[PDB]
From Swiss-Prot, chains A, B:
Disulfide bonds join C2-C28, C3-C44. The gene is CCL20. This is CCL20(2-70).
Length: 66, 66
């Protein structure tokens, strides 16, 4: 399914284990960052919000150093 | 469940839309990168492999530019 909107609350990175990018294309109507969480509830997030880019950067830096 | 090992099949970047990190101090025996695909299938991968780290960089750079 597609994100149709974005979460209204910052999600703490200690609960976040990954992300999936949703692109505006034939599949979905909007762009989104989908955060995957420890409790297996995925959370749609606004790619323009700074906290979203920051958490993505954090995840990316961790994998680089694994 | 936990990734108990790593795939040795091809990881085609065109079909990969996201990842999750599995860490060996969060309950599982080993670290893993779990790639998520458009078909909503997930694959366990070796976080130390250069190709794995490159797919993650691709996902991370795509997000940066969103």
């Amino acid at each position: 399914d597609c994100c149709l909107g974005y979460t209204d609350r910052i999600l703490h990175p200690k609960f976040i284990v990954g992300f999936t990018r949703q692109l505006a294309n034939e599949g979905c109507d909007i762009n989104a960052i989908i955060f995957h969480t420890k409790k297996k509830l995925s959370v749609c997030a606004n790619p323009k919000q700074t906290w979203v880019k920051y958490i993505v950067r954090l995840l990316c830096k961790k994998v680089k150093n694994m």
